[PDB]
Design a protein around this ligand. Structure first.
Ligand SMILES: *[C@@H]1O[C@H](CO)[C@@H](O[C@@H]2O[C@H](CO)[C@@H](O[C@@H]3O[C@H](CO[C@H]4O[C@H](CO[C@H]5O[C@H](CO)[C@@H](O)[C@H](O)[C@@H]5O)[C@@H](O)[C@H](O)[C@@H]4O)[C@@H](O)[C@H](O[C@H]4O[C@H](CO)[C@@H](O)[C@H](O)[C@@H]4O)[C@@H]3O)[C@H](O)[C@H]2NC(C)=O)[C@H](O)[C@H]1NC(C)=O
Ligand SMILES: *[C@@H]1O[C@H](CO)[C@@H](O[C@@H]2O[C@H](CO)[C@@H](O[C@@H]3O[C@H](CO)[C@@H](O)[C@H](O[C@H]4O[C@H](CO)[C@@H](O)[C@H](O)[C@@H]4O)[C@@H]3O)[C@H](O)[C@H]2NC(C)=O)[C@H](O)[C@H]1NC(C)=O
Ligand SMILES: *[C@@H]1O[C@H](CO)[C@@H](O[C@@H]2O[C@H](CO)[C@@H](O[C@@H]3O[C@H](CO)[C@@H](O)[C@H](O)[C@@H]3O)[C@H](O)[C@H]2NC(C)=O)[C@H](O)[C@H]1NC(C)=O
Ligand SMILES: *[C@@H]1O[C@H](CO)[C@@H](O[C@@H]2O[C@H](CO)[C@@H](O[C@@H]3O[C@H](CO)[C@@H](O)[C@H](O)[C@@H]3O)[C@H](O)[C@H]2NC(C)=O)[C@H](O)[C@H]1NC(C)=O
Ligand SMILES: *[C@@H]1O[C@H](CO)[C@@H](O[C@@H]2O[C@H](CO)[C@@H](O[C@@H]3O[C@H](CO)[C@@H](O)[C@H](O)[C@@H]3O)[C@H](O)[C@H]2NC(C)=O)[C@H](O)[C@H]1NC(C)=O
Ligand SMILES: *[C@@H]1O[C@H](CO)[C@@H](O[C@@H]2O[C@H](CO)[C@@H](O[C@@H]3O[C@H](CO)[C@@H](O)[C@H](O)[C@@H]3O)[C@H](O)[C@H]2NC(C)=O)[C@H](O)[C@H]1NC(C)=O
Ligand SMILES: *[C@@H]1O[C@H](CO)[C@@H](O[C@@H]2O[C@H](CO)[C@@H](O[C@@H]3O[C@H](CO)[C@@H](O)[C@H](O)[C@@H]3O)[C@H](O)[C@H]2NC(C)=O)[C@H](O)[C@H]1NC(C)=O
Ligand SMILES: *[C@@H]1O[C@H](CO)[C@@H](O[C@@H]2O[C@H](CO)[C@@H](O[C@@H]3O[C@H](CO)[C@@H](O)[C@H](O)[C@@H]3O)[C@H](O)[C@H]2NC(C)=O)[C@H](O)[C@H]1NC(C)=O
Ligand SMILES: *[C@@H]1O[C@H](CO)[C@@H](O[C@@H]2O[C@H](CO)[C@@H](O[C@@H]3O[C@H](CO)[C@@H](O)[C@H](O)[C@@H]3O)[C@H](O)[C@H]2NC(C)=O)[C@H](O)[C@H]1NC(C)=O
Ligand SMILES: *[C@@H]1O[C@H](CO)[C@@H](O[C@@H]2O[C@H](CO)[C@@H](O)[C@H](O)[C@H]2NC(C)=O)[C@H](O)[C@H]1NC(C)=O
Ligand SMILES: *[C@@H]1O[C@H](CO)[C@@H](O)[C@H](O)[C@H]1NC(C)=O
Ligand SMILES: *[C@@H]1O[C@H](CO)[C@@H](O)[C@H](O)[C@H]1NC(C)=O
Ligand SMILES: *[C@@H]1O[C@H](CO)[C@@H](O)[C@H](O)[C@H]1NC(C)=O
Ligand SMILES: *[C@@H]1O[C@H](CO)[C@@H](O)[C@H](O)[C@H]1NC(C)=O
Lengths: 213, 136, 236, 108, 249, 136
């Protein structure tokens, strides 16, 4: 990618934020019209700017554009919780195809410490029947998007029973992550007291469920 | 560009050629020569009744341009502001996207209220201000 | 605002020819241009090409010339403005760098640019064989009996390759359901689950049946929530 | 950015409606047959150059069975059929008593 | 967009259409209404089927004056042998045109269900191919056509039961009736087949029997194979559009 | 203000609203739809003969405004001086006192001599001076 973005921009709720997008003197932001996009990975992207200063119909007047002798930028006055996502820029003409940027990551701070609906699922009469020993942990709306996965097989150091994922952006504009346990019934029967340790600043009301009852 | 030869094309390209749409509108390929010894036949009655409806559609809009100061030309602006409540789309947006075709179906509703407002700010106010402003 | 219908879950081994389709609905398909784009694993989206459905004009990237060849059909009018059409995309001699999400976009009128996108087609260009999801029902949660609300769902052990659509009682139970993020394992297989928060004071007179679907492995396996409770949550 | 009303004349927009039409016919026999029942002595003439303008991007819904031009052609011909032969010989007193036989040969 | 239409000839006939639009490469099915058998269906032909029409009845001129001035002209004397009008048609050409008619109805109507019969009931003018030719009105038969029952998809002597009629108050003239004057000598055709008119098969529920015949009793539908492509519109030249510009003093 | 809804009111208040008097003058509440199978009845003949007299009254005055440079608007002044011999009353006086009603009965006499003079000073002299003055 030749057209570069600010890569990592941080802002706060109800405060103005600006993203500095700069390109080389070949695909420079001087003659080419520039456009911005709100692209959440996996979801459908939304057109923010369709022509430098002009916004796409339906898009809030909070968003504004500016174009210099080679670089283009985007200003977002009064930040909202839905805004934290990876953005993309575009350089184009009425003769040629679109030019795409590297991508800038936006973190909208100021949000409250959202307590998650943490649930630990033990193996049922069907999960144990198919000879599969598993223990999963759900996490829903836990802002910030920081995760701390820790398994306790009789409160001993776990090496083999570790399976972590990437915390994806949830519907409430917060975060959602996944944690799995891939073990055979042999290594599973050697330990019985299975404690779930999820470190998020707060209280100690964690759901500790035994796989054997 | 042809009679209605810009209807398909967007508003921007439609406003580019709209004189032909008014040129062949009256005496084009329908006027003709207009040539038992009597002209009281079924074709004679049908041609003269159609002639009345022909001028009626022209004069209705012709009178409006005359009472707007837009009589002298095809395209002439007015001193009337656009109430945002009527249409919320960008000026440049409908001109290369919506086209006159769909656009008439959008205004037709407030079109009479628009005509009412067009008469006063541009003529009943502007031309009535002249009475005192002409000599000073 | 117009809705696009993007055909998904199609994928194959490297070198083979991939065919991706998209149905256009509720707009004038004729004068509205069509744009095609893809995004790699390295967060760098590569603009593939631009195509016109009214005229034969096209603009394509040099990296997608000999490999990518596109085609379009005639518009099917519904009203004096609305129409229905479709665009097809053929890619030849694919690599593991071509693996990613492929999107279809609706035109604007400075017109060459898009306006609205489709759902998404996650293309997996891998030589490895297809695996069918191992659907297993989950025992009651470790929540409460106060009012009834308590979690209950299902778990999908192993399958290969994504995407996988999972619903509850065939498009009936959509609210109060969380879709767990499906992520790859150490062996190179994806894994997911589903959690539903319904008022369950005691197991009885309620719908616990779900729906699991796949394209390269066609799945039918649907298992309901375990009555033989293995948790303290649905007790006290 | 400061939206002001602009008046445009000659806008290419149509509204579905029906009006009174008229003839368009070329010179036929001219010398021998001068007035045939439909065209009569004075019919509105036709132009050798018709407006062949085709409109791209226009998918107008046509009404085959509910077309109002069909009803116009229905009334024009019958009214003309009643008009034609009006100045001609009335066969009102012709209808009288009728006595007969068949042919000189028995049906051969 | 046209300001002048096609060369539409005022068709004066029942059963068969004589002039006009012939939309090519397939036979066009004009559907006013089709799901319900009850309503009439007009069918446009792809290629013209030429039809000869003669009358070898050779008649002289007899003028008898009714009161002052007025002159009445009637059939004089027939010179030669007694014979029918004699329209004539091809055998194979028609069969070939029917070939795609039966094939199209298999697509429109369900499967290969039983579908044949002749003109039901009616007066002479309604059930026969009543048409003006050279002056006189010909009343030829529509029986040798619907004689073919088929499911899976100069020239030859084919004629119909030809009969002449002079007392004609066409379209049922309850006020002014017309007497057709005879035509002295030669009778020629130089006409065409530009379509046809069909009908129902009662009100049978479901079944395997849906026998179709010619029962189109309307003159409006005869020009519906001509004005199918036409629709009149009112032009609105006045247009109001906002843009960044205004007037001053 | 209504069709002729300013006739009662003085010239000043009559000149304030005179567009409605020309608006409902043609296609207002008299135009309508204009909808045995024939339209040659007593109502058909009466409507078309009235249509001829309808345009005749408009076009007579419409041609005059066109040959005065006043065609573009409702109210437009001219370069014609007022001969005191015609009327001796003050400009402001008839506008709040006499009213258009009585005023037409005062001018009607020299009205044709006024129309004759209006053609030359404003058009036959002013627009004919342009021929040489347009390019300099
Ligand atoms: C679709 O529409 C068309 C409209 O064009 C329908 O056309 C049918 O065409 C035929 C064939 O022409 C008509 O029959 C005859 O037309 C003749 C044309 O004559 C002209 O030249 C004459 C020169 O005279 C010499 O040659 C003619 C050749 O026919 C001899 O008959 C004649 O004895 C001479 O040897 C001129 O004298 C004449 O006036 C024309 O300028 C006519 O000649 C012939 O008419 C006879 O009777 C007439 C009655 O008034 C009389 O005036 C003529 O003088 C003459 O004696 C005759 O009409 C069909 O009538 C015509 N109609 C139909 C419905 O078939 C076409 O059919 C129609 N339908 C479709 C496609 O289905
Ligand atoms: C051509 O015209 C037809 C007219 O029939 C039109 O389609 C019709 O649409 C109506 C919609 O209401 C259909 O009505 C129903 O069809 C069902 C299914 O067969 C019947 O079970 C119904 O029975 C009713 O009527 C009975 C008789 O009175 C009653 O006894 C009974 O209680 C019900 O009230 C009813 O018929 C109708 O069947 C169709 N016609 C068909 C399918 O033949 C059609 O749209 C037109 N097509 C075009 C556009 O060419
Ligand atoms: C005039 O502009 C206004 C204000 O922008 C329009 O009113 C409302 O605008 C909002 C825009 O956010 C519309 O919301 C839309 O909802 C749909 C469906 O959930 C969504 O897809 C869009 O992205 C958007 O969020 C809202 O529907 C609209 N309300 C209505 C019913 O009018 C207004 O419509 C514009 N012009 C008109 C036609 O009056
Ligand atoms: C005036 O503005 C309205 C705002 O949308 C435009 O449309 C309105 O639409 C509704 C719903 O379609 C109309 O209701 C009608 O009901 C009849 C019942 O027979 C039905 O046949 C129609 O299809 C329609 O559903 C409503 O009449 C219509 N108008 C108003 C004033 O509310 C409308 O186009 C605008 N323009 C005009 C010319 O009024
Ligand atoms: C109209 O009448 C003609 C006969 O006068 C029918 O024509 C014949 O139709 C049949 C079947 O539809 C044809 O049969 C095929 O012949 C080919 C020759 O190679 C053969 O390969 C096929 O297996 C089959 O036997 C036949 O050729 C054709 N010709 C004849 C005998 O004249 C025609 O079908 C009638 N109209 C209809 C029913 O549509
Ligand atoms: C189509 O052509 C066929 C040619 O044979 C006609 O067929 C038969 O015509 C007879 C005499 O009208 C019908 O007879 C009737 O049968 C019923 C049976 O219950 C009886 O109740 C009556 O008193 C009478 O005897 C016979 O049904 C009929 N067969 C059929 C149904 O095709 C046929 O009628 C022609 N279709 C029409 C009328 O267009
Ligand atoms: C009935 O339909 C047929 C369609 O086959 C019509 O046939 C065409 O009639 C025209 C005259 O109206 C012929 O035009 C002339 O052809 C000759 C011979 O080559 C040529 O030298 C002249 O320059 C002229 O173009 C035309 O060829 C003929 N087509 C054929 C080959 O069948 C017929 O006119 C229709 N009958 C009517 C109008 O009543
Ligand atoms: C045009 O202005 C002239 C000159 O002012 C008017 O002509 C004459 O004006 C005198 C004004 O002193 C009129 O005298 C009046 O006599 C009556 C009755 O004795 C008296 O009540 C008034 O106070 C005044 O003194 C005189 O009648 C009038 N002459 C005529 C017959 O016109 C002239 O009338 C004005 N406009 C017209 C209508 O031409
Ligand atoms: C033209 O200026 C004159 C000046 O006053 C205006 O009125 C004129 O008034 C006299 C006397 O009233 C008119 O005499 C008429 O005699 C007939 C006899 O039948 C009688 O019926 C009338 O009532 C009237 O007394 C005179 O005709 C009249 N006109 C002229 C030219 O002297 C007059 O209104 C001004 N306008 C016009 C339209 O001429
Ligand atoms: C009907 O047939 C008769 C028999 O030939 C034709 O009669 C001829 O008419 C011409 C016209 O002048 C005469 O000169 C011949 O002498 C007649 N021949 C005889 C012996 O009758 C007649 O022409 C035919 N039909 C019409 C109406 O022309
Ligand atoms: C163009 O007009 C169509 C008409 O429905 C509309 O749907 C589309 O959003 C418009 N695009 C813009 C924003 O100009
Ligand atoms: C046609 O000919 C047949 C066979 O002679 C005869 O039965 C019938 O009456 C004629 N007419 C009609 C209208 O079918
Ligand atoms: C019937 O008309 C056709 C078309 O001209 C002709 O070829 C045929 O010879 C005619 N019939 C006779 C008398 O042979
Ligand atoms: C107003 O007009 C009347 C009409 O007769 C007149 O008598 C009166 O003197 C006028 N007043 C003035 C001087 O404006």
């Amino acid at each position: 990618s030749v057209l570069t973005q600010s890569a990592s921009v941080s802002g706060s709720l109800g405060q103005s934020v600006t993203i500095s997008c700069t390109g080389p003197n070949s695909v420079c932001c001087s003659h080419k019209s520039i456009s911005w996009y709100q692209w959440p990975p996996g979801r459908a992207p939304t057109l923010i700017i369709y022509e430098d200063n002009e916004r796409a119909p339906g898009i809030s007047p909070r968003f504004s554009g500016y174009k210099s002798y080679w670089s283009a930028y985007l200003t977002i006055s009064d930040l909202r919780p839905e805004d934290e996502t990876t953005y993309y820029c575009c350089s184009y003409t009425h003769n040629s195809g679109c030019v795409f940027g590297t991508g800038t990551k936006v973190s909208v701070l100021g949000q409250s410490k959202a307590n998650p609906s943490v649930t630990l699922f033990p193996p049922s009469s069907e999960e144990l029947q198919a000879n599969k020993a598993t223990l999963v942990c759900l996490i829903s709306d836990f802002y910030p998007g920081a995760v701390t996965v820790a398994w306790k097989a009789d409160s001993s150091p776990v090496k083999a029973g570790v399976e972590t994922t990437t915390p994806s952006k949830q519907s409430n504009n917060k975060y959602a992550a996944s944690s799995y346990l891939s073990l055979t019934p042999e290594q599973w029967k050697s330990h019985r007291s299975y404690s779930c340790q999820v470190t998020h600043e707060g209280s100690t009301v964690e759901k500790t469920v035994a796989p054997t009852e | 560009l042809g009679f209605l030869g810009a209807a398909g094309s967007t508003m921007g390209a439609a406003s580019m050629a709209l004189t032909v749409q008014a040129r062949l509108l009256l005496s084009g390929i329908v006027q003709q020569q207009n040539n038992h010894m009597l002209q009281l036949t079924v074709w004679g009655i049908k041609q003269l009744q159609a002639r009345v409806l022909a001028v009626e559609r022209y004069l209705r809009d012709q009178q409006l341009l005359g009472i707007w100061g837009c009589s002298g030309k095809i395209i002439c602006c007015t001193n009337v502001p656009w109430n945002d409540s009527w249409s919320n789309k960008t000026i440049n947006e409908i001109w290369d996207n919506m086209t006159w075709m769909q656009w008439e179906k959008e205004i037709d509703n407030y079109t009479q209220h628009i005509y009412t407002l067009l008469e006063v700010s541009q003529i009943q106010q502007e031309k009535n201000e002249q009475e005192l402003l002409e000599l000073d | 605002e117009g809705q696009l219908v993007q055909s998904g879950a199609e994928l194959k081994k490297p070198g083979a020819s991939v065919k991706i389709s998209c149905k256009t609905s509720g707009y004038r398909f004729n004068f509205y241009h069509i744009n095609w784009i893809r995004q790699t694993a390295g967060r760098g989206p590569e603009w593939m090409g631009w195509i016109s459905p009214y005229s034969g004009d096209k603009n394509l990237a040099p990296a997608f010339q000999d490999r990518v060849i596109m085609t379009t059909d005639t518009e099917v009018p519904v009203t004096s403005f609305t129409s229905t059409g479709a665009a097809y995309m053929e890619i030849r001699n694919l690599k593991f760098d071509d693996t990613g999400t492929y999107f279809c976009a609706k035109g604007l009128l400075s017109t060459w640019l898009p306006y609205l996108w489709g759902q998404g087609t996650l293309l997996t260009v891998s030589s490895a064989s297809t695996k069918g999801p191992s659907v297993f029902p989950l025992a009651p949660s470790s929540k409460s009996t106060s009012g009834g609300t308590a979690a209950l769902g299902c778990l999908v052990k192993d399958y290969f390759p994504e995407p996988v659509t999972v619903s509850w009682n065939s498009g009936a139970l959509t609210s109060g359901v969380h879709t767990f993020p499906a992520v790859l394992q150490s062996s190179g297989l994806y894994s997911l689950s589903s959690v539903v928060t319904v008022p369950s004071s005691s197991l009885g007179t309620q719908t616990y049946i779900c729906n699991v679907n796949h394209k390269p492995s066609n799945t039918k396996v649907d298992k309901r929530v375990e009555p033989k409770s293995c948790d303290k949550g649905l007790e006290v | 950015a400061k939206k002001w009303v602009t008046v445009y004349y000659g806008v290419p927009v149509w509204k579905e409606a029906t009006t009174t039409l008229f003839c368009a016919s070329d010179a036929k026999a001219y010398d021998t047959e001068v007035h045939n029942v439909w065209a009569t002595h004075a019919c509105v003439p036709t132009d050798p150059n018709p407006q062949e303008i085709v409109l791209g991007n226009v998918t107008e819904n046509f009404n085959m069975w509910k077309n109002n031009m069909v009803e116009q052609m229905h009334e024009d011909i019958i009214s003309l059929w009643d008009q034609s032969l009006k100045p001609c010989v009335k066969l009102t007193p012709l209808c009288v008593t009728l006595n007969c036989n068949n042919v000189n040969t028995n049906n051969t | 967009t046209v300001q002048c239409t096609h060369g539409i000839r005022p068709v004066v006939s029942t059963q068969l259409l004589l002039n006009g639009s012939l939309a090519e490469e397939e036979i066009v099915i004009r559907s006013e209404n089709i799901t319900d058998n009850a309503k009439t269906i007009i069918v446009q032909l792809n290629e013209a089927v030429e039809i000869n029409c003669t009358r070898p009845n050779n008649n002289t001129r007899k003028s008898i004056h009714i009161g002052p001035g007025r002159a009445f002209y009637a059939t004089g004397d027939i010179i030669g042998n007694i014979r029918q009008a004699h329209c004539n048609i091809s055998k194979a050409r028609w069969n070939e045109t029917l070939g795609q008619i039966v094939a199209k109805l298999e697509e429109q109507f369900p499967n290969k269900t039983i579908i044949f019969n002749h003109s039901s009931g009616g007066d002479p003018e309604i059930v026969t191919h009543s048409f003006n030719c050279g002056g006189e009105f010909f009343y030829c038969n529509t029986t040798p056509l619907f004689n073919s029952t088929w499911n899976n998809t100069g020239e030859q002597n084919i004629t119909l039961q030809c009969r002449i009629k002079q007392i004609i108050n066409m379209w049922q003239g309850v006020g002014k009736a017309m007497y057709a004057p005879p035509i002295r000598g030669q009778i020629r055709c130089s006409s065409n087949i530009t379509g046809l008119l069909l009908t129902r098969d009662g009100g049978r529920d479901q079944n395997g029997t849906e026998t179709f015949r010619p029962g189109g009793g309307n003159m409006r539908d005869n020009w519906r194979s001509e004005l199918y492509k036409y629709k009149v519109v009112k032009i609105e030249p006045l247009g109001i559009a906002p843009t960044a510009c205004k007037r001053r003093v």
